[PDB]
């Protein structure tokens, strides 16, 4: 599923991501924009052999099981395929674990490089929320 901007903002809010660990909704929408362009089915293979999955491009090295990432963990206790669903519940629950891990949203390199410090409220501007 390719979400609309405000559509995703609303789904993220419904799933309790707004201000989670102090990160406003716009931060989450911004991260999703640059990680996946709002596409739940996004995947990307990393040089180390791991793969990133879903709207927030969660990586198989630590967070989900895809059966093809040697030496990895599955800390969210989910198949990586669950991160591709039109239903964002799995991605949101896993993102909550990730953002609690110690480095906040810096875990998402694209958030650090493209969202951090910017006017992220613009990502939810206009939205009915």
UniProtKB/Swiss-Prot annotation:
GO biological process, one term: cell wall macromolecule catabolic process
Tissue-level expression: In the egg white and polymorphonuclear leukocytes.
Catalytic reaction annotation: Hydrolysis of (1->4)-beta-linkages between N-acetylmuramic acid and N-acetyl-D-glucosamine residues in a peptidoglycan and between N-acetyl-D-glucosamine residues in chitodextrins
GO cellular component, one term: extracellular space
EC number from the UniProt entry: 3.2.1.17
Subcellular location: Secreted
Pfam families found in the cross-reference section: Lys
Chief place of localization: secreted
Alphabetized GO MF terms: beta-N-acetylglucosaminidase activity; identical protein binding; lysozyme activity
Catalytic residues of the enzyme: 35, 52
Similarity field: Belongs to the glycosyl hydrolase 22 family.
Note: Lysozyme C is capable of both hydrolysis and transglycosylation; it also shows a slight esterase activity. It acts rapidly on both peptide-substituted and unsubstituted peptidoglycan, and slowly on chitin oligosaccharides.
Role according to the record: Lysozymes have primarily a bacteriolytic function; those in tissues and body fluids are associated with the monocyte-macrophage system and enhance the activity of immunoagents. Has bacteriolytic activity against M.luteus.
Entry protein name: Lysozyme C
Gene: LYZ
